[PDB]
Amino acid sequence: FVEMVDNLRGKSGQGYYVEMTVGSPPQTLNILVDTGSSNFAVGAAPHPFLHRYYQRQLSSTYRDLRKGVYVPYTQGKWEGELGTDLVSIPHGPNVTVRANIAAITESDKFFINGSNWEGILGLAYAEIARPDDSLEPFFDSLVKQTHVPNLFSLQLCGASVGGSMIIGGIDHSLYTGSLWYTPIRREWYYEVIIVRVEINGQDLKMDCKEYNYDKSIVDSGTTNLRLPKKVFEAAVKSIKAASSTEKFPDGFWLGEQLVCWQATPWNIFPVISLYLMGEVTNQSFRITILPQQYLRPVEDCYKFAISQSSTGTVMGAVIMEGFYVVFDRARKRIGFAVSACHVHDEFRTAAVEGPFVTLDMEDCGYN
Numbered sequence: 001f002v003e004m005v006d007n008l009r010g011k012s013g014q015g016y017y018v019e020m021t022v023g024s025p026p027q028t029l030n031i032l033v034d035t036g037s038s039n040f041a042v043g044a045a046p047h048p049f050l051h052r053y054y055q056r057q058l059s060s061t062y063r064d065l066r067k068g069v070y071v072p073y074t075q076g077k078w079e080g081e082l083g084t085d086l087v088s089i090p091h092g093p094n095v096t097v098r099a100n101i102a103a104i105t106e107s108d109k110f111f112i113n114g115s116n117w118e119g120i121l122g123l124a125y126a127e128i129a130r131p132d133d134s135l136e137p138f139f140d141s142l143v144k145q146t147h148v149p150n151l152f153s154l155q156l157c158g159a160s161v162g163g164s165m166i167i168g169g170i171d172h173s174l175y176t177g178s179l180w181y182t183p184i185r186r187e188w189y190y191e192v193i194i195v196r197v198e199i200n201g202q203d204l205k206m207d208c209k210e211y212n213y214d215k216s217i218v219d220s221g222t223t224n225l226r227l228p229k230k231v232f233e234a235a236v237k238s239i240k241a242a243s244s245t246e247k248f249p250d251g252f253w254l255g256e257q258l259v260c261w262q263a264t265p266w267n268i269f270p271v272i273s274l275y276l277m278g279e280v281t282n283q284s285f286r287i288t289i290l291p292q293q294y295l296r297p298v299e300d301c302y303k304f305a306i307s308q309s310s311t312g313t314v315m316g317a318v319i320m321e322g323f324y325v326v327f328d329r330a331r332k333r334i335g336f337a338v339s340a341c342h343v344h345d346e347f348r349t350a351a352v353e354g355p356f357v358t359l360d361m362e363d364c365g366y367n
């Protein structure tokens with residue numbers, strides 16, 4: 001796994017991408033790592049923002065599937081032609097597989113101008129693959145056609161970001177302390193149940209069903225910790241309270257404006273804790289984030305990285321960047337451990353702790 005360490009790059013706010021190759025001879029593309037979709041899609045036309053793109057005409061192992069795909073989103077969309085070809089990951093396991101590839105021939109508000117990536121690797125489940133669940137996601141394919149075990153892990157390290165994606169195992173030097181696993185409520189997104197939220201060790205005092213409405217997910221494809229509406233009201237109310245010492249433009253708590261400091265009063269900001277449903281009946285654990293997780297640097301200035309959401313809780317790069325996250329697909333469970341590469345300070349750290357006793361955890365999901 002020393003092979004796979006530090007195999008992720010990116011730029012702040014612009015996702016984490018991994019080098020891959022497609023076709024024979026191999027064509028190298030930077031592909032964005034996304035645990036919140038399930039399509040493998042790449043630029044196949046010379047869009048102006050792209051450094052490079054998939055040239056099917058160059059590939060002896062390309063097979064057309066004579067079948068289009070449309071994928072719209074809030075703003076924008078991408079459109080492609082479906083096909084398969086030989087795919088490998090240079091700094092991954094030492095194999096090559098045939099997987100589905102959507103060749104993007106038309107997009108709109110998909111590619112980022114100035115970014116250094118050219119496609120997306122959907123690592124979530126077939127249930128949200130477009131056009132429908134019959135398009136076997138890349139990871140499914142890899143596990144079938146090789147002896148690579150059904151799991152991966154992500155250490156996202158935080159204008160230039162880095163990280164590690166360990167495919168097919170765990171690297172114990174990427175985390176400290178112990179791994180705690182919450183279960184994957186259903187194999188579509190990486191869906192989890194959150195059963196408590198504290199701040200500096202103080203309950204937010206809400207029905208737990210409100211933390212997970214209409215779902216909670218683990219998503220390397222999102223930047224912010226995104227909480228739902230109700231939860232977000234209550235959570236800002238309490239961070240503002242803990243940091244009365246200084247006051248801030250009542251728009252900044254919406255990411256609109258960024259606050260600056262010379263040469264930054266860390267102790268003024270609370271730790272957040274999420275309790276997640278555990279492996280055992282009535283048992284939970286909690287993950288704790290420092291302010292240096294939800295206050296991210298720009299270019300000493302900082303963006304407020306917790307957002308109003310309306311499609312549920314999303315534990316994005318803000319959460320994930322403090323922890324080593326294990327996507328134990330084999331045993332329908334997600335693992336969290338304190339990352340070796342998260343930013344500390346003198347007096348406090350991020351933490352993964354348990355066990356705790358929590359009754360009626362089922363009643364936290366939506367139906």
Ligand SMILES: Cc1ccccc1-c1ccc2nc(N)c(CCC(=O)NC3CCCCC3)cc2c1
Binds near residue numbers: 034038077078
């Ligand atoms: C920017 C965009 C422009 C046009 C076409 C798609 C996208 C796009 C691409 C990848 C994404 N990945 C993510 N993780 C998220 C956040 C959560 C989410 O809604 N995920 C997806 C579920 C599967 C189907 C698409 C949405 C959003 C994404 C949006």
